[PDB]
Design a protein around this ligand. Structure first.
Ligand SMILES: Nc1nc2sc(CNC3CCN(C[C@@](O)(Cn4cncn4)c4ccc(F)cc4F)CC3)cc2n(-c2ccc3c(c2)N(c2ccccc2)CCO3)c1=O
Ligand SMILES: [Cl-]
Ligand SMILES: [Cl-]
Length: 211
């Protein structure tokens, strides 16, 4: 329905710019970071479901799917985790992300590298190592389905999403940069998952292209 546009916190915009502009070849770390976030979301619904089993009425299966689409030049990471509320998307996550962004930037000035971003809690933004645009479809039990989108440049949008219901969880859609299409290829995604995400406690299914 109505699209609302918001500015990132200045610190978050600055982090995104650093991610986009810094020469840094080891871009594959984005996948570990997004998988980690998906795992954390799954952990949360699992834990909440032990005191309120009805929280799984929106979907019992706790899983991560990684879906390449070469025709659309997208890599999608779908989880059936807890999902994000409207307040999470617009304000609350970025509020928390300020402190870790500051710590990370400081660590970079003192000699850390970009692969340490997850040690600071702000690994989502590493998506911009490979994506020109990120679309996030999300649904929490206590809210409606939303679509968040950002092509960086200091702004993001949020709108009620009337597309296909996802039930519960989050779908991170990476619109890949032209030179980052290796991350649509079978061997490559498998190699990266095996290297950095081997012990995640939820089934990770790596889909193949149909063509
Ligand atoms: N696949 C996912 N499923 C989920 S479902 C959910 C709610 N569930 C909560 C999530 C955070 N959990 C951890 C934590 O509270 C830890 N913490 C507390 N104090 C300091 N750190 C936290 C909060 C803010 C934050 F930036 C990182 C964090 F790790 C608590 C449960 C968040 C979430 N995320 C996620 C994780 C991360 C993020 C963002 C999103 N951000 C984002 C925002 C808008 C649009 C796109 C992405 C930006 C910052 O990063 C997923 O990708
Ligand atoms: Cl923000
Ligand atoms: Cl819930």
């Amino acid at each position: 329905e109505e699209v609302e546009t918001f500015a990132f916190q200045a610190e978050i915009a600055q982090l995104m710019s650093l991610i986009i502009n810094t020469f840094y070849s080891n871009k594959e770390i984005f996948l570990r970071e997004l998988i980690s976030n998906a795992s954390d979301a799954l952990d949360k619904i699992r834990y909440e479901s032990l005191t309120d089993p009805s929280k799984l009425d929106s979907g019992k299966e706790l899983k991560i799917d990684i879906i390449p689409n070469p025709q659309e030049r997208t890599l999608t990471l779908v989880d059936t985790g807890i999902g994000m509320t409207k307040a999470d998307l617009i304000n609350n996550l970025g509020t928390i992300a300020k402190s870790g962004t500051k710590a990370f930037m400081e660590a970079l000035q003192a000699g850390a590298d970009i692969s340490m971003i997850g040690q600071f809690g702000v690994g989502f933004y590493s998506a911009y190592l490979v994506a020109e645009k990120v679309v996030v479809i999300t649904k929490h039990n206590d809210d409606e389905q939303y679509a968040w989108e950002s092509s960086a440049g200091g702004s993001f949008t949020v709108r009620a999403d009337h597309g296909e219901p996802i039930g519960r969880g989050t779908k991170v859609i990476l619109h890949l940069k032209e030179d980052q299409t290796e991350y649509l290829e079978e061997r490559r995604v498998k190699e990266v998952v095996k290297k950095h995400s081997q012990f995640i406690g939820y089934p990770i299914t790596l889909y193949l292209e149909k063509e």
